[PDB]
Amino acid sequence: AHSVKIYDTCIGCTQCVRACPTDVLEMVPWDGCKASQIASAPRTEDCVGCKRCESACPTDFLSVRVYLGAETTRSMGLAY
Amino acid sequence: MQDVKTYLSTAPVLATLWFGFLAGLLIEINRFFPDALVLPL
Amino acid sequence: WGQDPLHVRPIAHAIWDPHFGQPAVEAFTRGGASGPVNIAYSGVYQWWYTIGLRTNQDLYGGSIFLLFVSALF
Amino acid sequence: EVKIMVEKDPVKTSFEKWAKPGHFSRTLAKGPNTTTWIWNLHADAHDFDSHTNDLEEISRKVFSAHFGQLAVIFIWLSGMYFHGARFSNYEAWLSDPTHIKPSAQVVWPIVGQKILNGDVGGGFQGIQITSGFFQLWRASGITSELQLYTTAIGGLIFAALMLFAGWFHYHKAAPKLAWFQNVESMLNHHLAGLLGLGSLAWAGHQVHVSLPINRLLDAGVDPKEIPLPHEFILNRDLLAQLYPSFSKGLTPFFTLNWSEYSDFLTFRGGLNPVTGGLWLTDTAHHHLAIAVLFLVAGHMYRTNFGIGHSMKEILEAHKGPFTGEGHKGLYEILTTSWHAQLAINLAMLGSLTIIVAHHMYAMPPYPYLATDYATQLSLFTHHMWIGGFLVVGAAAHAAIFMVRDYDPTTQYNNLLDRVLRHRDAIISHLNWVCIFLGFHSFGLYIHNDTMSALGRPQDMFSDTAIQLQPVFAQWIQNTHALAPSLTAPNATASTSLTWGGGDLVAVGGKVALLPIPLGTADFLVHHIHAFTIHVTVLILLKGVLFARSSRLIPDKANLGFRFPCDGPGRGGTCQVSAWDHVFLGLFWMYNAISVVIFHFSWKMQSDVWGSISDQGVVTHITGGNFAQSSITINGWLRDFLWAQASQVIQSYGSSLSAYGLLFLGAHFVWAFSLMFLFSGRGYWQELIESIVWAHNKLKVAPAIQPRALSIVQGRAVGVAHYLLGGIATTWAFFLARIISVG
Amino acid sequence: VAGLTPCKESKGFAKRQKQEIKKLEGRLKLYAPDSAPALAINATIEKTKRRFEFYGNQGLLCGTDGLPHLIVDGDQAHLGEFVYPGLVFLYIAGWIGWVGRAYLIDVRTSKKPTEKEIIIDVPLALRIMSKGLTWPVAAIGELRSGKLVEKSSNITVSPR
Amino acid sequence: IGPKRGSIVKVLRRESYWFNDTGKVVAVDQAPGVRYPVVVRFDKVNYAGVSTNNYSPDELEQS
Amino acid sequence: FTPPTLNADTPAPIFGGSTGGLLRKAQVEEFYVITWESPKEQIFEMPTGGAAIMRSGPNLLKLARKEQCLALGARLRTKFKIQYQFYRVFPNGEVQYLHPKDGVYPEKVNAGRTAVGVNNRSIGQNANPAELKFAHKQAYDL
Amino acid sequence: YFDLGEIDNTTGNWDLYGNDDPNRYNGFQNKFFETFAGAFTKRGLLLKFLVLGGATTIGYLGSTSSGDLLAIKNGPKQAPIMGPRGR
Numbered sequence A: 001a002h003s004v005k006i007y008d009t010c011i012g013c014t015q016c017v018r019a020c021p022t023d024v025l026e027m028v029p030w031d032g033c034k035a036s037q038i039a040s041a042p043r044t045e046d047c048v049g050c051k052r053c054e055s056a057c058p059t060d061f062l063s064v065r066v067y068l069g070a071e072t073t074r075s076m077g078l079a080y
Numbered sequence B: 001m002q003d004v005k006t007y008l009s010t011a012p013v014l015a016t017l018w019f020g021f022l023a024g025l026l027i028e029i030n031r032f033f034p035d036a037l038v039l040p041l
Numbered sequence C: 001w002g003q004d005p006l007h008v009r010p011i012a013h014a015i016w017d018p019h020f021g022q023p024a025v026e027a028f029t030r031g032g033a034s035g036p037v038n039i040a041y042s043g044v045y046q047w048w049y050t051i052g053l054r055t056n057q058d059l060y061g062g063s064i065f066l067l068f069v070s071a072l073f
Numbered sequence D: 001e002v003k004i005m006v007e008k009d010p011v012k013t014s015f016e017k018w019a020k021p022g023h024f025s026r027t028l029a030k031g032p033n034t035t036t037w038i039w040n041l042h043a044d045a046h047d048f049d050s051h052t053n054d055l056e057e058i059s060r061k062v063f064s065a066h067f068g069q070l071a072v073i074f075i076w077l078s079g080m081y082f083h084g085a086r087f088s089n090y091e092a093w094l095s096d097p098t099h100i101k102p103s104a105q106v107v108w109p110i111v112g113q114k115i116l117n118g119d120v121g122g123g124f125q126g127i128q129i130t131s132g133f134f135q136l137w138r139a140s141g142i143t144s145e146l147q148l149y150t151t152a153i154g155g156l157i158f159a160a161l162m163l164f165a166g167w168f169h170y171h172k173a174a175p176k177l178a179w180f181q182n183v184e185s186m187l188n189h190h191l192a193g194l195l196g197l198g199s200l201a202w203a204g205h206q207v208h209v210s211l212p213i214n215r216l217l218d219a220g221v222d223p224k225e226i227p228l229p230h231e232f233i234l235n236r237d238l239l240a241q242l243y244p245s246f247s248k249g250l251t252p253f254f255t256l257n258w259s260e261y262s263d264f265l266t267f268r269g270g271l272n273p274v275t276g277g278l279w280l281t282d283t284a285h286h287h288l289a290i291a292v293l294f295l296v297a298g299h300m301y302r303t304n305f306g307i308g309h310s311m312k313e314i315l316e317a318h319k320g321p322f323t324g325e326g327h328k329g330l331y332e333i334l335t336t337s338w339h340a341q342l343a344i345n346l347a348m349l350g351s352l353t354i355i356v357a358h359h360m361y362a363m364p365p366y367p368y369l370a371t372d373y374a375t376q377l378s379l380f381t382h383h384m385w386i387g388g389f390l391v392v393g394a395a396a397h398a399a400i401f402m403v404r405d406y407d408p409t410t411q412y413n414n415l416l417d418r419v420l421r422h423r424d425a426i427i428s429h430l431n432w433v434c435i436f437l438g439f440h441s442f443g444l445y446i447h448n449d450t451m452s453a454l455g456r457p458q459d460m461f462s463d464t465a466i467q468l469q470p471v472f473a474q475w476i477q478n479t480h481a482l483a484p485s486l487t488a489p490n491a492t493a494s495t496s497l498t499w500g501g502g503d504l505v506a507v508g509g510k511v512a513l514l515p516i517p518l519g520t521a522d523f524l525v526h527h528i529h530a531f532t533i534h535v536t537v538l539i540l541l542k543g544v545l546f547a548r549s550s551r552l553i554p555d556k557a558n559l560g561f562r563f564p565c566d567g568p569g570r571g572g573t574c575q576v577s578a579w580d581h582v583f584l585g586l587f588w589m590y591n592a593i594s595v596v597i598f599h600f601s602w603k604m605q606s607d608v609w610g611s612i613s614d615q616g617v618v619t620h621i622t623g624g625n626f627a628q629s630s631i632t633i634n635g636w637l638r639d640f641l642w643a644q645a646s647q648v649i650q651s652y653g654s655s656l657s658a659y660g661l662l663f664l665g666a667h668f669v670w671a672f673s674l675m676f677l678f679s680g681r682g683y684w685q686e687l688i689e690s691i692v693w694a695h696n697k698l699k700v701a702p703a704i705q706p707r708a709l710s711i712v713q714g715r716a717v718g719v720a721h722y723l724l725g726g727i728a729t730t731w732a733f734f735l736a737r738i739i740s741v742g
Numbered sequence E: 001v002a003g004l005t006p007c008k009e010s011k012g013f014a015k016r017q018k019q020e021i022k023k024l025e026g027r028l029k030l031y032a033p034d035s036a037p038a039l040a041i042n043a044t045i046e047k048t049k050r051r052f053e054f055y056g057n058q059g060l061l062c063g064t065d066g067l068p069h070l071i072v073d074g075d076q077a078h079l080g081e082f083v084y085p086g087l088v089f090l091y092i093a094g095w096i097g098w099v100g101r102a103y104l105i106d107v108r109t110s111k112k113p114t115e116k117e118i119i120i121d122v123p124l125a126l127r128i129m130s131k132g133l134t135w136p137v138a139a140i141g142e143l144r145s146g147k148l149v150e151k152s153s154n155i156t157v158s159p160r
Numbered sequence F: 001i002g003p004k005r006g007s008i009v010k011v012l013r014r015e016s017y018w019f020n021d022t023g024k025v026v027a028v029d030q031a032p033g034v035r036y037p038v039v040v041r042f043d044k045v046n047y048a049g050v051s052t053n054n055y056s057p058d059e060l061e062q063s
Numbered sequence G: 001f002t003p004p005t006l007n008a009d010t011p012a013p014i015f016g017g018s019t020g021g022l023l024r025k026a027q028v029e030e031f032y033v034i035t036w037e038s039p040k041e042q043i044f045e046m047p048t049g050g051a052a053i054m055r056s057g058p059n060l061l062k063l064a065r066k067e068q069c070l071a072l073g074a075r076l077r078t079k080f081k082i083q084y085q086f087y088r089v090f091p092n093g094e095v096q097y098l099h100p101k102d103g104v105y106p107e108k109v110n111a112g113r114t115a116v117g118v119n120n121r122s123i124g125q126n127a128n129p130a131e132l133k134f135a136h137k138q139a140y141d142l
Numbered sequence H: 001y002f003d004l005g006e007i008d009n010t011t012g013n014w015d016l017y018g019n020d021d022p023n024r025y026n027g028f029q030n031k032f033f034e035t036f037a038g039a040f041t042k043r044g045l046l047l048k049f050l051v052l053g054g055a056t057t058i059g060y061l062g063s064t065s066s067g068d069l070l071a072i073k074n075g076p077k078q079a080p081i082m083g084p085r086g087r
């Protein structure tokens, strides 16, 4: 549904994963930062699109980026 | 006065003291020189 | 309106409303019409008068011609 | 266990904490970095729960803030008595009040505003006041302006005492948490000591001061030759010539011969035909009764003397089969959360202020209150707006209790847990009754507008068309008029004149009150009122119930109260917060209270307020057009919003032209609100970025970065200008129209 | 000029003086002649008569409404309507703009530059509010020396 | 790598808030493979409220 | 990492009933089951609205959304020291285990997971939309 | 309450107010309704004659109506109201 993209400006601060309320983001190993980890979005079909990860990203400009695309019953947040 | 004058130098107090002086001046201009539509000088 | 463009209100179209009472039928009858009509405030009478259209048959022929033009398009 | 817990000198009285502005919050103590720091400085200024997690210092902050509020109200009362003493015509109005308008504000002759000092009468120029202070001082027995100056300087003394107590109960001896948690003692000393002894003391004033002076004012005696209030206490024969029951001298009180006090303690009812205001023998019996009843009710709870009630024992014994473990933990709610008690107290104070508004147009308590129509409209309108604001704030602090003080571990299977457990049912059935009320009142208005537009006056909801007579109200008004004969014997007359007992009271040639008719128009506008109150309840109760979580956002309590949104996800989570429900309930309070005061103004300008000529003919201000024009929106726009606005727009060049200026400036503040309400932060942030670029070009960049207002702040600014502009529009239109035709 | 009669010879402007005193004289009829509110209306009448004798003596132009109209084109007769108080204004408005600009330069080279804007340093402020008197000689002096404007390489610019 | 620690640099990154702004370098990572090693501290915060950001040496010049 | 199997014999927390629970999306589309092991009998805030007494052993809670499982799960990870996992249950009977996928929570890094949805460029090096007209690819997915 | 043997009983698929009674009428009443409502069964057939039959039945009484039945077919019954400026 929603497309969440991680860019190489990430410092591995992990707070995009901690702010995620639908378990989209996970921290995979990486070689481009001091923390040696970058975020990724394997369960991007579960993304509501709330951009809590973009609110918690301290990198200017943002490393996690959520693009609101086709919206399904996962990304609409319904219970009915 | 190391901190009382610091409070008196804050943004709302200095706006109140300046605009109190500013509106105090412009009212007193408008008493002795009222209805001023054209500057004669 | 072509006979007297100063004292005749230009009529747009007739009104067929099932919700009118008799005051609404008697009050919307303007311009010397047989029923309740809408007064045209679009300036189409002034336009068609200045351009050369005089009778209702000329306006009907123009309506058929522009039906044909829209059909061609 | 109830006793005084204070401790000495918690914080030192120093100005070094005045110099640092954001000392209360950890985020604002680092100093400013953007221009949003200034707005969070004011937003978190009074929010004492966000400062510290210790409820003891929070309660001390709230207690000294109460004392500062009391100091501000005593400064305000000092000003209004000093304005009566020096800048009023209160002695001139008190000589004859049927021709001289009440005025207590003189403007300075500076810029052409000296035309606002209008001819109010009595050889006086000033702003005609509508606050009702003149009739209040006439009911208090105030005869001279020296008494007003003495009350002003006494109020200044009490304002200094409240400032001293606010300093004392935060910096010298501040109470501890268990002192504030003695709610049984606080209720015992508020019911008996505050509302009981206050009613008893005002009853003593209304026995010795208000009653004989106001009896002499009904006799046409000049107030300069009326004896002073202490002369009735000293010379009791002077008090006995007006009431012979004073000749016995306190022996019927202790021998239970209270009927011998029937000369000055009566259950008359109705209005004084001399003045148009309630009797003070009834207002003194009223205060003596609510004092001998609030002092009884103040001996109910258990403090430390054995007798009484633990209210936890009252609550925990109140449990039912439809609830199970209900009412348990609500004592722990209402003694550990300031916001829950604030919600209950604000709901009662707002609803009570609405009670005050109705029980003052209908039973006018002050002499020449009813016949001064400006005072009646302004007092009703002011108390409706205060009451609506306080009930919206009640729902606000209910929601703040949910997001910041509701502990789910202590509340299992009680009333609050089960109300949260079926909040979908509450909000959905409230939604149904709101939509049903909206169609069955406003669509009835739309139907009347449509058939009046289509030339079908018989197809409407009129008194001549399909009738919708309020048979329950028309029966309860007959039940309240035909009461003295059988269900309430000992009454000389009836409770109010608006019930149907006759008594066309004419004071000064102007109608005080008469029987108020209730027809199809009153039915329609009362269903509008019920609809608007229900919708305000719907947004506000939805914000209270969905403050913790929702089906949309299950972690909404972690986001807080003043958060804008979660984001553009789940379709968009804009205005999910409980704050945003308070924000929308402020608009629905505008809608509700504005239609309430519009129905009030038109209903009594059409059916109550007017003049009486010879041979008993009553000519109202807008004669009889409420029954036929207030059933359509075109009548409300035409015979109310256009016909009665023909004195706010042509008041220019007169004393009421400031009402025209504030009418137009109130339209300005309303259209200014629509800038903040309809727009959003990011547009203004990029426009400010262009302005910051222009400042960078000319080296006038501030180090405090210019930022757009926050989304919560932009909505707050928009609703503040919407309420301020619309309320000031109605204030200007009301206070120009009813002053002009009054 | 522009079809407007002068206000000293305008019959409509003298009509508005006649109907303004007559409104105030009828307000005076219901007061005692030595009373305190009658002294305010008597001071209002003398304020009105001073106003109408000031507008006619300045060469103001009155239209068909009897109202003084301002000619802002830059006429040699009409300098005090727009040009003379405009130059008086822009001197005062440039004084506000120069002492606020010079305050920000003086606090940008400080230890905490953001605490000097919420808490304005009055000895630093008042020593340059006097210096804003001679500001056209200091604004064009900074314009000619290049210190007024900042080069675009050191200015924060949003991307395309 | 990096220009210098404790030096004044100007950001050439287009999408940063501090583009064409004076910043102070506080840390340069000398580990290979790091894309943005130079840590630059700024006197002014961005809209997120932070002043610490990592840039490559290609996006900075000494000023 | 072997995913845990849903036992379907552990019991529910003591809850009086809520109207915020499973609607017809549970019946035809999906519903979410969260299973966690408890130290003792506690009281927790229900993400549908309300409070329930959680059991002294393993607990099973049926939820409608994936966000309700994280809102509950982060509540009993910070207030309580309880490890949790949840599932996705479909109406045909298939139970899809969802979190944590490697057995360790996604805040902590694991060597088994791979980078997906990761761009080696930044935002400023994304291509303009004018040079990607009429293509399935967009400015960020390449 | 999860079972893995009955997926409908653990998800809310309950006939909350349903009944399993086979019949409660008699054969005489049942044969009358299916005979009369036998040409109204098919959705594609019923949508055809309801649109075509519904368009005719509003055009019939729209046209055969009288002056007292509907005011729009009554027409004006008084002198027309002349507007301002002689129009």
Ligand code: CLA
Residues within 6 Å of the ligand: D011, D012, D013, D014, D015, D017, D018, D019, D021, D023, D024, D060, D061, D062, D064, D065, D067, D068, D069, D072, D163, D164, D166, D167, D170
């Ligand atoms: C002059 C005597 C004095 C001094 C030096 C102090 C010292 C202190 N007070 Mg205060 N206090 C005093 C009198 C004093 N107080 C009184 C009279 C009250 C009763 C209101 C209290 C109650 C009190 C509370 C409850 C709190 C303190 C605290 C504070 C600290 C700084 C707060 C601050 O910034 O104040 C500056 C504040 C102001 C200038 C605002 C004053 C507002 C007044 C009441 C007027 C408001 C209405 C006014 C008419 C404006 C209306 C709007 C207008 C546009 C019309 C500091 C230790 C705080 C503290 O220690 O916590 C960290 C705290 O929370 N004080």
Ligand code: CLA
Residues within 6 Å of the ligand: D063, D066, D067, D070, D161, D179, D180, D182, D183, D185, D186, D189, D190, D192, D193, D194
């Ligand atoms: C019989 C004693 C008594 C009485 C008269 C009151 C009266 C009052 N209380 Mg108090 N209170 C008492 C005992 C009493 N209290 C007890 C025992 C408790 C402890 C459990 C509390 C704790 C409590 C708190 C925490 C607060 C109050 C507040 C209030 C005020 C109500 C708000 C208001 O605007 O009212 C109308 C206000 C007035 C009429 C002003 C009257 C002020 C004068 C000086 C009397 C007050 C002094 C004292 C209480 C009684 C002295 C009597 C004296 C006249 C001889 C009012 C001053 C509230 C407040 O505003 O805080 C300041 C507040 O929330 N009370």
Ligand code: CLA
Residues within 6 Å of the ligand: D042, D043, D044, D045, D046, D047, D048, D342, D346, D389, D390, D392, D393, D394, D396, D397, D400, D561, D562, D579, D582, D583, D586, D720, D724
């Ligand atoms: C008994 C009265 C009472 C109590 C104790 C409080 C107490 C509080 N309120 Mg409030 N509330 C109430 C009633 C009250 N309120 C009412 C009347 C409303 C409806 C408007 C609400 C709605 C409510 C909401 C929506 C929220 C609170 C919150 C707050 C908290 C701090 C707000 C702050 O720092 O002030 C800030 C003060 C200002 C910004 C001053 C602005 C004043 C108004 C808005 C504009 C000016 C109006 C003025 C009359 C017009 C003059 C114009 C002229 C100057 C040109 C505090 C707990 C906030 C919170 O976080 O609670 C924890 C918040 O989010 N309140």
Ligand SMILES: CC1=C(/C=C/C(C)=C\C=C\C(C)=C\C=C\C=C(C)/C=C/C=C(C)/C=C/C2=C(C)CCCC2(C)C)C(C)(C)CCC1
Residues within 6 Å of the ligand: D662, D664, D665, D666, D668, D669, D724, D725, D727, D728, D731
């Ligand atoms: C000064 C100045 C100025 C001016 C200003 C202007 C421009 C104006 C605007 C304004 C407008 C254009 C409007 C406004 C309006 C107002 C208002 C509106 C206000 C109000 C206030 C208040 C305070 C209120 C009160 C109230 C209330 C609260 C409630 C009830 C009612 C009332 C009313 C009583 C300028 C800038 C030039 C310059 C500088 C200075």
Ligand SMILES: CC1=C(C/C=C(\C)CCC[C@H](C)CCC[C@H](C)CCCC(C)C)C(=O)c2ccccc2C1=O
Residues within 6 Å of the ligand: D675, D676, D677, D679, D680, D681, D684, D685, D707, D708, D709, D710, D711, D713, D714, D715
């Ligand atoms: C206009 C507007 C702004 C911009 C509003 C701003 C920047 C507030 C302006 C406040 C004053 C005018 C600036 C600060 C004034 C200083 C005290 C300096 C004094 C200068 C003069 C006022 C004397 C928003 O931020 C916004 C956010 C969300 C929805 C709508 C809107 C919105 O409509």
Ligand code: SF4
Residues within 6 Å of the ligand: A006, A009, A010, A011, A012, A013, A014, A015, A016, A017, A038, A039, A053, A056, A057, A058, A059, A062, A063, A064
């Ligand atoms: S929050 Fe931003 S910087 Fe931190 S790990 Fe996530 S993407 Fe990287």
